[PDB]
């Protein structure tokens, strides 16, 4: 697991919050050589945002990182670990009394202001389970629909770092149909508040992990270019990579052109990613020799990504499959040698490749391994209806034998008793 062509400077640029620490740490993990770099970049931002839970984690890896780098031929700043810790520990108690003296006031908006400060500084220190609850109680101290949303957005933010995606979606489903179906029209012709652009960033990414790549594409394709850089979940440069490769695999040729290629909504995101754009195009243009050539060499980088690692087979393979169907179906008889180099492989390989797909998949075609050709195999309608009718009738006859004897055995009270 490694790729040299990787820019960590950009990887950190578009992200923030915990997402910076989570992604930087996943890169350092699966990508060595750039573990020298990746652990230094997690360290620096952990020292901001009053964070000890992550420093004790991250810096401990820096030691074992440099330890293994001395096997080819930094120090625990405990002066700082104390400094941020007591600073943070007492800042909790300040915000504690701030909320407790906001609760003594009995103001609806002032207590929600307190709550949102508490959850923030418990997030800061790496504490998730505590940070979680602060926003939950902020539901009670509300009035408007916007207040029940502006908290429900935060509710999700944390349930992403926690990795309970089931509750990510439970509160997106609530937040979506909260203000009478998103204020009806969307704030009268183009909204300054890009809100659902976020709500579908999560509704998708939650499904991404949950294997529903088609349901994920539906939520990631609707992602408009109003929200762009939302660093605490997923960048727009990834929304293109993620939702594009998702649809590609699970979408037919028809929905592609319509809901992917010629749709302006998502078109802007494709512009951002020129390589992702070319593979979606070369699929539809049916120039497969290149289509996969591109995708293979992208696999190296896309694996090192945090959220696109765990679907790198089911997607990549499902696309290959899709194309293999789409290449052949039009032909009644196709030369395998042409199809071979077209799918970056060998003749013999192609032979077995198809074989499996014949049995399982919808490749209704046989193999002539003598001259290495693939012929389309279509059904003799007549034979079919005849064939089965005999067989079904013979099954019906067999059960009729059985339930005639079964009428007899019960009629005679036939059974082997125990005692």
């Amino acid at each position: 697991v490694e790729n040299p062509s990787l820019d960590l400077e950009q990887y950190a640029a578009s992200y923030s919050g915990l997402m910076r620490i989570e992604r930087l740490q996943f890169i350092a993990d699966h990508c060595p050589t750039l573990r020298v770099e990746a652990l230094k970049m997690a360290l620096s931002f952990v020292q901001r945002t009053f964070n000890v839970d992550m420093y004790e984690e991250i810096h401990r890896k820096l030691s074992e990182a440099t330890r293994e780098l001395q096997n080819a031929p930094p120090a625990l700043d405990t002066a700082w670990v104390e400094a941020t810790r007591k600073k943070a520990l007492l800042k909790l108690e300040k915000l504690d009394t701030d909320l407790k003296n906001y609760k003594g006031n009995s103001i609806k908006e002032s207590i929600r202001r307190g709550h949102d400060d508490l959850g923030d500084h418990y997030l800061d220190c790496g504490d998730l389970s505590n940070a979680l609850k602060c926003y939950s109680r902020a539901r009670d101290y509300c009035t408007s629909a916007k207040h029940v949303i502006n908290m429900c957005l935060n509710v999700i933010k944390v349930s992403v770092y926690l990795q309970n995606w089931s509750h990510v979606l439970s509160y997106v489903s609530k937040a979506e149909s909260t203000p009478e179906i998103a204020e009806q029209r969307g704030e009268r012709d183009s909204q300054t508040q890009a809100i659902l652009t976020k709500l579908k960033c999560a509704a998708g990414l939650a499904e991404l992990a949950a294997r529903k790549y088609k349901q994920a594409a539906k939520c990631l394709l609707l992602a408009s270019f109003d929200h762009c850089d939302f660093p605490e979940l997923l960048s727009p440069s990834n929304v293109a990579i993620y939702g594009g490769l998702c649809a590609l695999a699970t979408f037919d040729r028809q929905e592609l052109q319509r809901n992917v290629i010629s749709s302006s909504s998502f078109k802007l995101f494709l512009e951002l990613e020129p390589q992702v754009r070319d593979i979606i195009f070369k699929f539809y243009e049916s120039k497969y020799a290149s289509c996969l050539k591109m995708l293979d060499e992208m696999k190296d980088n896309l694996l090192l990504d945090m959220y696109l690692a765990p679907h790198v087979r089911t997607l990549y393979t499902q696309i290959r499959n899709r194309a293999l169907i789409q290449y052949f179906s039009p032909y009644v008889s196709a030369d395998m040698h042409r199809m071979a180099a077209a799918f970056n492989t060998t003749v013999a390989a192609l032979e077995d490749e198809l074989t499996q797909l014949i049995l399982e998949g919808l490749i209704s075609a046989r193999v002539d391994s003598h001259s290495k050709i693939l012929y389309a195999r279509d059904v003799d309608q007549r034979s079919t209806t005849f064939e089965k009718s005999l067989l079904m009738g013979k099954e019906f006859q067999r059960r009729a034998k059985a339930m005639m004897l079964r009428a007899a055995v019960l009629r005679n009270q036939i059974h082997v008793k125990s005692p």
Partner: protein, 99 residues
């Protein structure tokens, strides 16, 4: 008339990412205004970002209105604006009825 000169500079520059944003915003401002030649200068350049985009049904109608503004006043683009009204109807894949 400010958005006219903005669409005129980026038509010389070839910035389709801003031009698309500019034309969409110069249709809400197209309402609260009297009536100059300029109201066709933006429509012809706006139709060009629906030929480029692909949706020829939103370029076709754009080039009919821009052609009409050069019809009333000056006609430097009227001789080449009809080229985009006809090119639309053919590529509209249905029209085939220009003149």
């Amino acid at each position: 008339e400010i958005y006219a000169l903005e669409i005129q500079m980026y038509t010389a520059q070839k910035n389709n990412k801003k031009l698309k944003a500019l034309y969409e915003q110069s249709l809400h401002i197209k309402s609260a205004i009297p009536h100059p030649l300029i109201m066709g200068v933006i429509r012809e350049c706006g139709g060009k970002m629906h030929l480029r985009e692909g949706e020829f049904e939103k370029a076709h109608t754009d080039f009919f209105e821009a052609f009409k503004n050069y019809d009333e006043s000056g006609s430097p683009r009227r001789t080449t604006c009809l080229k985009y009204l006809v090119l639309a109807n053919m590529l509209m894949k249905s029209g085939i009825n220009p003149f």
